């Protein structure tokens, strides 16, 4: 601790390097220190420990090294018993009176204990008098029973009288300055409320306070000023700041948001500086402290959503509207972007707490938050933000389908003009939030799109092959279960079936082609594949001529993120350049054979990829996937073990070599017979006995090792696979159902049919998601008061006000007998 008002301040404040508290003279105590602590204001009090102190002290010690704050401490020099020592913190009256005044004069509590001359004076020259009331008895106790009484003079002389009379009729001439104190933080912050004296300037020192249930009481008041423009600056002040109880009591005092939204306000709110990756991010995707507009903010959110997506605010025209009512539809909407852009999660909570189409939003956020953690804490914020916002969906998924199935049906599809017409199927599917398909609505409907309009349910697939092999005859009975054979047609289902056949077609025709003979001139069946692959790159070209969103030079890009499209386009190419190098004489017709033979390879793997919908096969897949890489690790351990003793076991023998490029297969045949042979002048041969057994005994202790390994992996993919595999459904389905209905060899006919070709609801629904939302909120509020560890803690909290009240009870009780 260290030990003219201008100059003494100064120099106290120099050694220390520390609106005001000064005491003069256990929950009252500890409050006044917590709202010292929160305020930060020095305490003046006696530097003498002893007395009113020693009450001080025993607080302070209390709580004050669990801040520090700048107690002043004054005391007389004189009464320093060591002169040496004197020469609390930061260690006369005039002095605190002048301090007093220049912390007023920049844009004064005084608390008694146990005096009244000095408070009268002070009173009357400082403009504010908000002396706090002491409960001890004394020159307090008489000022606060004259300044409650307003008989007391013959009182005053039984307890000088003429001395206290003068003193209550002063005290009476600035009645109602003497801060009241009655059985202590919001008392205090009353009389500081009251003591400092606009409208606007009580607003924002209760802003900066942030005692939002304390600076309730002192707002709250009938025929208040509120001048027109200060709650404009109040509310950006608050939204600024990360208080929400007083955004809340904005909201409830009258301020309207969407009054409030204007597009320099939310500028300005972007390009701020003062709170707690998004500039890194904007400049990446876009320039120090360069002015951000709705325009760059839009793109940036573009970038983050993924590739095929847009933006009702990030488009080139709302760009140019910006740029030459002007109130946002939805404030809510942007407002959230903005709290999630911005890693402030609770006011992103409180908005979704009111908004319309909050699935929407809700999933939008998990997206937004998985994105941001996978660009760039950030693994903390990745495991909760997203994490809790898809379990918000999931949970408001759960309430609608409880409240009604067909309503929930409807509302997880359906057009949004604000978030460029995405349906939350596809939101949650970007987002491979694989929980919300899982549920048992999504999945519902899934089935009934991959049914399409076919009802029936049991043996689909043997009545989708019976209709494939008879339409004639199948389609009429099979539609109950014209326009039926044409309903049935468009199905995916059975198009899933026809690509299929269509498919096993091909692949007998490839394996009767490349494996029996070749001539000059192709056969039927080369041609009959040919014109497959032909119509196959037909397909795949419309396909991404359709994909236009991003225009067609950015149209590719997003089309080329799948890796099997791509491995499909080099197939296609290899298989073209082989069958054109046949055709080239025998010369070159048996060089090109072999490499449309190696093509086979690609087309029996592509099965695969289709191999993944069904419930028991996915899994093998998976396997086989997780566990290639295992294998690929594997292989540097096989070799580094094998091949050392391989070499070794070598360089023994052929002691006379040449190397004639011929020794790799001499290394790497180890073979087992040979080897087990040769296991069974001395030194010579047993030494590559010992080669031999080493390199037996590893054989099988690596085979061993990846008997185990497989088993473990194969284990731990199971025990997932199970929940993965519902994900790909939503996929298949979407693919196959835009797919025309002939197959690949014939859909050349169906692009000449396509070129021959060529709102109380919703606020029903609105009003259904205010209900859901409500019910859910008072759902969660009731089963948490209802939870036994809050109901102990209530009840332990009550017994002990109730058994003091007991105690204090039974004292009058004794007095009155
Ligand atoms: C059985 C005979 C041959 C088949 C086994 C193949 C050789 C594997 C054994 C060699 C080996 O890795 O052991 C290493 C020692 O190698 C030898 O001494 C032999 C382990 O070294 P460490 O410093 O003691 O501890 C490190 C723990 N990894
Ligand atoms: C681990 C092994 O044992 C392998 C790894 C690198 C291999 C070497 C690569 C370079 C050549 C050049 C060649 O000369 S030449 O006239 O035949 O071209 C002879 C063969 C030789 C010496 C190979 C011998 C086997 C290796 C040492
Ligand atoms: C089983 C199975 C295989 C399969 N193969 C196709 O459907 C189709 C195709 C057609 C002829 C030859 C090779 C492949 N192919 C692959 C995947 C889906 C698709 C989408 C658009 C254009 C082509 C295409 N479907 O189920």
Partial sequence: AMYKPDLLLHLMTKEWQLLLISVHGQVFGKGLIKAAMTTGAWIFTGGVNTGVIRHVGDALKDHASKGKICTIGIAPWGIVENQEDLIHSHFEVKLRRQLEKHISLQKVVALIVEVISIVLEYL???????????????????????????????????????????????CMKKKELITVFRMIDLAILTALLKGANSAPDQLSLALAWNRV???????F?????????????????????????????????????????????????????????????????????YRISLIDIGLVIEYLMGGAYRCNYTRKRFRTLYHNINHFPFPFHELMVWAVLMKRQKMALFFWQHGEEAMAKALVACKLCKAMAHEADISQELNHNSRDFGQLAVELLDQSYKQDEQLAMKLLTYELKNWSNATCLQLAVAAKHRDFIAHTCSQMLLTDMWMGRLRMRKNSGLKVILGILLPPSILSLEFKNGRKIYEFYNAPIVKFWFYTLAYIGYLML??????????RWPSTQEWIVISYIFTLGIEKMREILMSEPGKLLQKVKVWLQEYWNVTDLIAILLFSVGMILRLQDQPFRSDGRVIYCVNIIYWYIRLLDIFGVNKYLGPYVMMIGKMMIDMMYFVIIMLVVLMSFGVARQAILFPNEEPSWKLAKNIFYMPYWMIYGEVFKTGAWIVPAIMACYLLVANILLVNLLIAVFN??????????????????????????????????????????????????????????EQCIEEYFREKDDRFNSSNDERIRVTSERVENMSMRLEEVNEREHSMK
């Fill in 124 to 170: 009357r020259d400082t403009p504010p008098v908000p002396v706090v009331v002491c409960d001890g008895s004394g020159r307090a106790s008489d000022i606060l029973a004259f300044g409650h009484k307003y008989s007391l003079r013959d009182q005053l002389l039984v307890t000088q009288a003429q001395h206290l009379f003068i003193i209550l009729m002063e």
């Fill in 712 to 769: 473990n992996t194969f284990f731990e993919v199971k025990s997932i696979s199970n929940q993965v595999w519902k994900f790909q459904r939503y996929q298949l389905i979407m693919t196959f159902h835009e797919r025309p209905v002939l197959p690949p060899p014939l859909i050349i006919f169906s692009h000449m049919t396509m070129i021959f070709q060529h709102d109380d609801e919703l606020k029903k629904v609105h009003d259904f998601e």
């Fill in 510 to 519: 490839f394996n009767y082609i490349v494996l029996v003979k070749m001539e």
């Fill in 213 to 219: 249930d304390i600076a309730r009481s002192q707002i």
């Fill in 221 to 289: 008041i009938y025929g208040q000023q509120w001048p027109v423009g200060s709650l404009e600056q109040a509310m950006l002040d608050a939204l600024v700041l990360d208080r929400v109880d007083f955004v809340k009591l904005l909201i409830e005092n009258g301020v309207s948001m969407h009054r409030f939204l204007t597009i320099s306000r939310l500028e300005e709110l972007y390009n701020t500086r003062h709170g707690p990756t998004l500039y890194h991010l904007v400049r990446d995707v876009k320039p120090p402290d």
